[PDB]
Amino acid sequence: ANQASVVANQLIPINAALTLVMMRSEVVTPVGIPAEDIPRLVSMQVNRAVPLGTTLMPDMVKGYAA
Numbered sequence: 001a002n003q004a005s006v007v008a009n010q011l012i013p014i015n016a017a018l019t020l021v022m023m024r025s026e027v028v029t030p031v032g033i034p035a036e037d038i039p040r041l042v043s044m045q046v047n048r049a050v051p052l053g054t055t056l057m058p059d060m061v062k063g064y065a066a
Contacts, residue, residue, distance in 0.1 A: 005028050005032035005033060008050045008056060009022055011051055012049065020042060033057065047061070
């Protein structure tokens with residue numbers, strides 16, 4: 001597997017806007033939002049709490065559509 005996903009680098013509280021310190025890139029399964037989309041996720045809000053080490057999925061970000 002070579003495809004990396006965005007993984008929460010800290011607990012992201014419900015309704016928080018994403019910042020760069022919150023997002024790392026890891027090869028995990030199941031695959032979530034592509035790690036190269038991290039720039040484009042900044043300031044978007046999550047619709048649930050995302051614990052440390054959880055893969056960020058399309059349905060967890062408000063307004064995500066790519």
